[PDB]
């Protein structure tokens, strides 16, 4: 959550969390997240539950684009950068980072892939650098009219409007197939 640097959306970085106790109450009551939309699990219900592992996929998008991060949602980013499964179970967190990501002159460090031949499968990360081909004639390789770099830069500005203000997004994904990472609670002696 407090990472010094956040990976680009086209290279959204996914981390593994296991063998620990996750206290989601502090996250829920922090109130610092523009976002805590939880699908399949009530946000104030994960303290009694637990899972095999937690998948934390972190990236950065525009504030207006955060909506595209949802199951069964159609959009450029949701289709060619990060697609969630229709039956996704987990929770999406989004919080504004304008002050930590916007600088005078345009912060172009954030990049997002736009053009792709086919829509991405769920949780499919595409790092291909191939030049998108919108014409019958392959270029092999001089970019130009209608032959493409498939990536574009956000160019966040300090004065950019909200829809254009940066937002750091972390998607927590859970799968239940022995329990490893369980939240906060106590044990008792066995009785037969």
């Amino acid at each position: 959550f407090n990472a010094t640097r956040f990976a680009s959306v086209y290279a959204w970085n996914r981390k593994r969390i296991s063998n620990c106790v996750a206290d989601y109450s502090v996250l829920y009551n922090s109130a610092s997240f523009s976002t805590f939309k939880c699908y399949g699990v009530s946000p104030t219900k994960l303290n009694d539950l637990c899972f095999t592992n937690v998948y934390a996929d972190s990236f950065v998008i525009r504030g207006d684009e955060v909506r595209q991060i949802a199951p069964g949602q159609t959009g450029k980013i949701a289709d060619y950068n990060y697609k969630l499964p229709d039956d996704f179970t987990g929770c999406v967190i989004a919080w504004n980072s304008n002050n930590l990501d916007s600088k005078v002159g345009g912060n172009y460090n954030y990049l997002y892939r736009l053009f792709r031949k086919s829509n991405l499968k769920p949780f499919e990360r595409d790092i291909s650098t191939e030049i998108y081909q919108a014409g019958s004639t392959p270029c092999n390789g001089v970019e130009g009219f209608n032959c493409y770099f498939p990536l574009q830069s956000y160019g966040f500005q300090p004065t950019n409007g909200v829809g254009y203000q940066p937002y750091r997004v972390v998607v927590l994904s859970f799968e239940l197939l022995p329990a490893t990472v369980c939240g906060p609670k106590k044990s008792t002696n066995l009785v037969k």
Partner: nanobody
Amino acid sequence: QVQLVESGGGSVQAGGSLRLSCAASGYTINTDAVAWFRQAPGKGDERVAVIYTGSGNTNYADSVKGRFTISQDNAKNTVYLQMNSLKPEDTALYYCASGYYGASGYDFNNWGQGTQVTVS
């Protein structure tokens, strides 16, 4: 299909009052819950207040309780935040967000350019 525009900010003395407006356009029927949040440059997002349009229930940040009041005008399709006894801590950009349901902070979206309030 839903737009929210914030207005009514400005510069006031400590202990002054301002009255911030969130005008909504489009088909806002689905969004029952509306919230006001603020962000100073250095700090992160915080929700000052939220209201349930249908029920009328309200929630307030502990700091703002007593000084801030949230109201709505259905004919105007606007949600209003009344700031009394403004304090220097109140200085930040203010925006209004909206969502179908109140469980989480994200489902609120559609917030506009925002309004700047400075207390000095």
